[PDB]
């Protein structure tokens, strides 16, 4: 997941997520939490969705 800083076009990353990111969102009055949807495409038999709520402070999984 890449945070693009548009002022200078820089960026920060959170790599090695459990799966590819179907969706992203900024969830909070101040953007405290990021809500992400992951897919885990390894399993082709079924679609394996995982909902992740990350604390924007230190980018640690608040709720998986």
């Amino acid at each position: 997941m890449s945070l693009w800083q548009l002022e200078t076009n820089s960026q920060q990353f959170l790599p090695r997520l459990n799966g590819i990111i179907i969706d992203c969102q900024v969830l909070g009055p101040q953007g405290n939490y990021y809500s992400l949807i992951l897919q885990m495409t390894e399993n082709n038999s079924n679609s394996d969705y995982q909902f992740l709520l990350l604390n924007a402070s230190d980018l640690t999984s608040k709720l998986s």
Partner: protein
């Protein structure tokens, strides 16, 4: 002697519409931001963010209304608070069933069931900013088309009325 019963949960629900992007997640974080509501295919789980545990689970099988309605239907969105009226939630389904449920408590066997009147529409999205509610609905080149209606509650008739805005 033996008996069969469901025990555990299932895959998280998702807005399985190809056209919509950025609105796939239907889970909502409470106004007080102390717990997250996530709808599954067969239940709705309320997790406490601070402790990272499932404080409450609302099973469709236990409730008669939910059992009939969902057990195909799927929750298209959850809205915090109760539109009709501090821990109520409004659940909008694909067909149009609107259900007012309560978490952080005991699920009442008689929720405030309602039904928005739709003619050959599949409800895709609902949303609000301040007391004003607009609903997006899908109607049918393999490309689906959309109409945007205005939703309001009339107390006298205790029904949801839809007025056309856009297509």
């Amino acid at each position: 002697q033996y008996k069969l019963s469901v025990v555990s949960g299932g895959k998280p629900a998702l807005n399985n519409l190809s056209s919509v992007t950025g609105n796939k997640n239907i889970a909502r974080l409470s106004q007080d931001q102390r717990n997250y509501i996530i709808p599954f295919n067969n239940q709705i789980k309320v997790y406490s963010v601070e402790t990272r545990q499932c404080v409450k689970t609302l099973k469709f099988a236990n409730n008669s209304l939910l059992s009939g309605i969902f057990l195909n239907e799927s929750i298209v969105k959850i809205l915090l608070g109760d539109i009709t009226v501090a821990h109520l939630i409004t659940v909008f389904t694909n067909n149009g069933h609107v259900i007012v449920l309560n978490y952080k408590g005991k699920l009442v066997e008689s929720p405030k069931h309602f039904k928005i009147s739709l003619a050959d529409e599949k409800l895709a999205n609902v949303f609000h900013s301040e007391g004003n509610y607009r609903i997006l609905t899908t109607f049918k080149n393999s490309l689906q088309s959309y109409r945007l209606y205005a939703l309001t509650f009339d107390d006298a008739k205790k029904q949801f009325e839809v007025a056309h805005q856009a297509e």
